[PDB]
């Protein structure tokens, strides 16, 4: 009832009581742990008031007015509005609180030491695809801030009936296209091949190259989605050079500065915001390890090891590992030399331990998903490899949601 | 009731039904996952027969005589012997079956493709510390096999009352000593500092150096333990050179060929074998990443990066990662050039996926602990990073047990 997590490198022990306020389920049971399953498992007015009340009781607690009159009047006000429309509307303050704490509660996010410094753009007055484009361009421009990146989220109107739903069909506001080839190979980003051809379906004219920024596909109030091209001046990009190897530029690689996730669902007080793109900045490994070297992504370990003149015959020459570190020195070096915000897996993981100490201290705990927090390389030489973590689902939260093209009752 | 695990690099799906035969609990519940907790949570005649029966029903099933007369007579034979002594004795065949399947069921072991090729040394006639030494030297000599290593386990008499207990007090048959210093630093292996001084307590004369092979501390039939020195000729060692950097030899490093774990408990049919050292061979990362570069181990990242002339000012030069790969090229190269069996994290992880396919096919599943199966470096460039895994506790099993010096009713 008062659980202990240990760090096995520092011998530091923390006591978790926050997991007692946990609500949802994890997928694990007493006889089976599913902590490595990637994706694990309309609303009525009955269900919706407990959710509103629970969220409002923590909101008013957080402003040092738990149970005051303004709390009770706000409680009954929401109760009354849920009676009338079987839904309700968040105050601007409540919306910003919910957004920040959704991030605070994201147990797979290593960057949460920043969770309270988040810019919330209320787009709940939006009605059209064009209005979404406008809101999204203002997000990008603000969050990029000339490479001095700033964290932000833009929140579109909440789901109501179900068939009226705002959705960004992109998985990220900014992604590179991916095109299959005659010989079955792939140019660009293979992750995006189905999306890239969906855009060509609804009308995109593709410039079939490597790093073609996809257009936006924006669906407003449940209508069919519409293509829009982000102005290239708002899309900041970093060419990848190496601080030692000059052939590295001949690799011709580049990536975009701004990671801005757009396919997730924000849940606040039982209300569901299906379109809520959020941006921060990159941990270096996301590009250099996963984006570039995932076998099903750009898969450049081949070419980098060639130019390094490595023993690629044997598996045990560790030529893959050796070419993996160079590439990540190059991403970091490139971003930093351009004053574009990036963090390295070492600095990021150290901050998360520092963040963990604060949450356990001033909150009773910190939900954390070791499988996702440990970086995809140099695991045990970062402090989080050695840090026991308790995972559990608190709310407000970010949830996965189906892709709109698999669910949209079309016309 | 018929769970699915996916590989997100191959899109391969496996169906797990073996977890239905799971028995023990995992530490996880519906509202909290503890899959990153390192160590998670006398027997009576009532409890012991169901355990015997369950184990015998799977043993006789495995020899294609499930429910035959020989099964029923063996069932009643054990039932009768449990009535008489409130314990019982395993047949030699049952002991070998149990040992192999304990390994087969070790969800943290990446090397399980070999689980059926295991040499079982029945030491259940042992009575004294000297007899343990003899059995243990024969284990080492056999398992080492001139560097063509062979997997083996030596099984000492099962626990009976509780105060009569065979225990190897070493955590591994072969470990390097660790000595604290005047200035508070550490020579040798810091993991073993408490054990190293325990040996000096009971009588060891230490040669206070780096790589001093500890003596054995062997406890038989619950008596106080006794020191024995393994004959240095049976202890095979590999000096660590690099195939490029000749200063690497001036580092003067070396490690022992044979990983042989001795502090664990083997559970078969409800019977508890508290002394059961098992050996196989090394995955390269165990030495090069963990043994050598754990901050609380030999911690050589400092010196290797110095000799490489790396930018050690900034964290983001990835100088730690760059010096980590060289060291693991060196361990593999050294072991291989000496015909001493070693496997690299790439070859080992690929075999585990191949092993996983067989178990799901011909067994219904394979318990697997992603946190422990993924290697401590180059995680996502190995196939197990992308492989969902279900963890659950089957039996026969290997269990952790307290250290004997924290529990032994002494004299
Ligand atoms: C400020 C800089 C940030 C850094 C350095 C960072 C870092 C990361 C990384 C490396 C991941 C794993 C993603 C993956 O491997 O696919 C992640 C996950 C996540 N981040 Fe953070 N992030 C940042 C900002 C944010 C912000 C501003 C939000 C929300 C407003 C957020 C919410 C999340 C969520 C919900 C996940 C889980 C995604 C999933 O389960 O697929 N992050 N973060
Ligand atoms: C044949 C070569 C083998 C290889 C390459 C191998 C590899 C590994 C590795 C890398 C680990 C993680 C250990 C750690 O990080 O501390 C492990 C764990 C384990 N291995 Fe295997 N192993 C082998 C043989 C064996 C044998 C012969 C047995 C038993 C008879 C065994 C039983 C176990 C168990 C029980 C664990 C879990 C230890 C724990 O939970 O602390 N292994 N193995
Ligand atoms: N710094 C950041 N990064 C970051 C943060 C959150 C989320 C993500 C993206 N998370 C994607 C994980 C994922 C999703 C779907 C699939 C997939 C692939 C094929 C088929 C089906 C699904 C695979 C993966 C990764 N394995 C990145 C960042 C972005 C915004 C703020 O901060
Ligand atoms: N190839 C092999 N390897 C291998 C296999 C099984 C087990 C092990 C050793 N597993 C030790 C894990 C461990 C235990 C205790 C502590 C610890 C440290 C400080 C205080 C208290 C406990 C820390 C760790 C590692 N974090 C290695 C091998 C050996 C035999 C066959 O195959
Ligand atoms: C905190 C964490 O559970 C702990 O450091 C684990 C992580 N995974 C591991 N994996 C292996 N193979 N060996 C280990 O010692 C550990 N340690
Ligand atoms: C199978 C496994 O759960 C899957 O590959 C996960 C592992 N950990 C991860 N961790 C991060 N940060 N991102 C990921 O995409 C994944 N993928
Ligand atoms: Zn779990």
Could you name the key traits of this structure?
homodimer; alpha+beta; Nitric Oxide Synthase, Chain A, domain 1; Nitric Oxide Synthase,Heme Domain, Chain A, domain 2; Bovine Endothelial Nitric Oxide Synthase Heme Domain, Chain: A,domain 3; 3 domains; 4-stranded mixed beta sheet; 3-stranded antiparallel beta sheet; 33% helix; 13% strand; binds protoporphyrin IX containing FE; binds 5,6,7,8-tetrahydrobiopterin; Nitric oxide synthase 1 (chains A, B)
Give a description of the structure:
The structure is a homodimer of 411-residue chains. The first copy, chain A, has 411 residues and is α+β, with helices and mostly antiparallel strands. Chain A has three domains: 16-124 and 151-161 and 265-279 and 349-373, Nitric Oxide Synthase, Chain A, domain 1, CATH 3.90.340.10; 125-150 and 165-236 and 400-404, Nitric Oxide Synthase,Heme Domain, Chain A, domain 2 (Alpha-Beta Complex), CATH 3.90.440; 237-259 and 282-347, Nitric Oxide Synthase, Chain A, domain 3 (Bovine Endothelial Nitric Oxide Synthase Heme Domain, Chain: A,domain 3, Alpha-Beta Complex), CATH 3.90.1230. Helices cover 33% and strands 13% of the residues of chain A. Chain A has ten helices and 18 strands. Chain A has a four-stranded mixed beta sheet, sandwiched between helices. A three-stranded antiparallel beta sheet of chain A has the order 5-8-9, with helices on one face. A three-stranded antiparallel beta sheet of chain A has the order 14-13-18. In chain A, helix 1 (45-62) packs antiparallel against helix 2 (69-85) and helix 6 (284-293) crosses helix 8. Chain A is globular, with a radius of gyration of 23 Å. Bound molecules: protoporphyrin IX containing FE (2 copies), the ligand N=C(Nc1cccc(CNCCc2ccc(-c3ccccc3)cc2CN)c1)c1ccco1 (2 copies), 5,6,7,8-tetrahydrobiopterin (H4B) (2 copies) and zinc ion. One protoporphyrin IX containing FE binds next to loops of chain B. Chains A, B: Belongs to the NOS family.
């Amino acid at each position: 009832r008062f659980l202990k997590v240990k760090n096995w490198e520092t011998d530091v022990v923390l006591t978790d009581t926050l997991h007692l306020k946990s609500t949802l389920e994890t997928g694990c049971t007493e006889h089976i742990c599913m902590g490595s399953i990637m994706l694990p498992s309309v609303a009525t007015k009955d269900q919706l008031f407990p959710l509103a009340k629970e969220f409002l009781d923590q909101y008013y607690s957080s402003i040092k007015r738990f149970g005051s009159k303004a709390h009770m009047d706000r409680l009954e006000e929401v109760n009354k509005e849920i009676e009338s429309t079987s839904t309700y509307q968040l105050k601007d303050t409540e919306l910003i609180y919910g957004a920040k704490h959704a991030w605070r509660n994201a147990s797979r996010c290593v960057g949460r030491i920043q969770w309270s410094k988040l810019q919330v753009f209320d787009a709940r007055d939006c009605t059209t695809a064009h209005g979404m484009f406008n809101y999204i361009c203002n997000h990008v421009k603000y969050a990029t801030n000339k490479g001095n990146l700033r964290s932000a989220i833009t929140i579109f109107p909440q789901r109501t009936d179900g068939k009226h739903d705002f959705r960004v069909w992109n998985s990220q506001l900014i992604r590179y296209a991916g095109y299959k080839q005659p010989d079955g190979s792939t140019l660009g980003d293979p992750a995006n091949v189905q999306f890239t051809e969906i855009c060509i379906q609804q009308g995109w004219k593709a410039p079939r190259g490597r790093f073609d920024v996809l257009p936006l596909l924006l669906q407003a109030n449940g209508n069919d989605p519409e293509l829009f091209q982000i102005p290239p001046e708002l899309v900041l990009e970093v060419p990848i050079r190496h601080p030692k190897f000059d052939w590295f530029k001949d690799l011709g690689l580049k990536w975009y500065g701004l990671p801005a996730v757009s396919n997730m669902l924000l849940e606040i007080g039982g209300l569901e915001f299906s379109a809520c793109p959020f941006s921060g900045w990159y941990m270096g490994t996301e590009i250099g390890v996963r984006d570039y070297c995932d076998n099903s992504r750009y898969n450049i370990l081949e070419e980098v090891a060639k130019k390094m003149d490595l023993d690629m015959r044997k598996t045990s020459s560790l030529w893959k590992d050796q070419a993996l570190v160079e590439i990540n020195i190059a991403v970091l070096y490139s971003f930093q030399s351009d004053k574009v915000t990036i963090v390295d897996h070492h600095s990021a993981t150290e901050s998360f331990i520092k963040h963990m100490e604060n949450e356990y201290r001033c909150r009773g705990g910190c939900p954390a998903d070791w499988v996702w927090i440990v970086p995809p390389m140099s695991g045990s030489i970062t402090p989080v490899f050695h840090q026991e973590m308790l995972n559990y689902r608190l709310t407000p939260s970010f949830e996965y949601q189906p892709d709109p093209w698999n669910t949209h009752v079309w016309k």
